[PDB]
Amino acid sequence: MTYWICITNRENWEVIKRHNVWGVPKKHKNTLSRVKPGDKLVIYVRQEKDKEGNLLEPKIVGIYEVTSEPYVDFSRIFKPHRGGKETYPYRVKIKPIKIGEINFKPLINDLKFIKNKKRWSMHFFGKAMRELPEEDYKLIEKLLL
Ligand SMILES: [Ca+2]
Ligand SMILES: [Ca+2]
């Protein structure tokens, strides 16, 4: 088995919850190809701003379990996160395990995958998902009420 942290935003988090699909663009297809049924996905949403300019801190919002092998499907369900026409066609089916909401920032000091504590964001930049050490998954699972 393998644990992963998946990077998305609030709008697509809603799509994920409704469709039970985790998808990534072509540049990250190689990483997704390693995912197998049974794997756990920690869902993370980046920092955003609401319409009134209020900052929405980065959060862990849930844990899902992978239920299918990777597949390809170009159905338009996600909102292109950078304003393009991206469909995030390479996907796995998933099912919910846990739905919650905890701030991510206070956790960096204790998350092993964050090697560079001073600029933790570098571990998320240009990535859709990355493997989580078992210890990191265990800590997040316990904290996500
Ligand atoms: Ca694009
Ligand atoms: Ca693209």
Curated annotation (Swiss-Prot):
Gene3D superfamilies, per the entry:
ph1033 like domains
Could you tell me which NCBIfam families the record lists for this protein?
PRK00809.1
Q: Which PANTHER family match?
A: UPF0310 PROTEIN MJECL36
Family from the record:
Belongs to the UPF0310 family.
Q: What name is this protein filed under? A: UPF0310 protein PH1033
Which organism does this sequence originate in?
A: Pyrococcus horikoshii (strain ATCC 700860 / DSM 12428 / JCM 9974 / NBRC 100139 / OT-3)
Lineage of the species this protein comes from: Archaea, Methanobacteriati, Methanobacteriota, Thermococci, Thermococcales
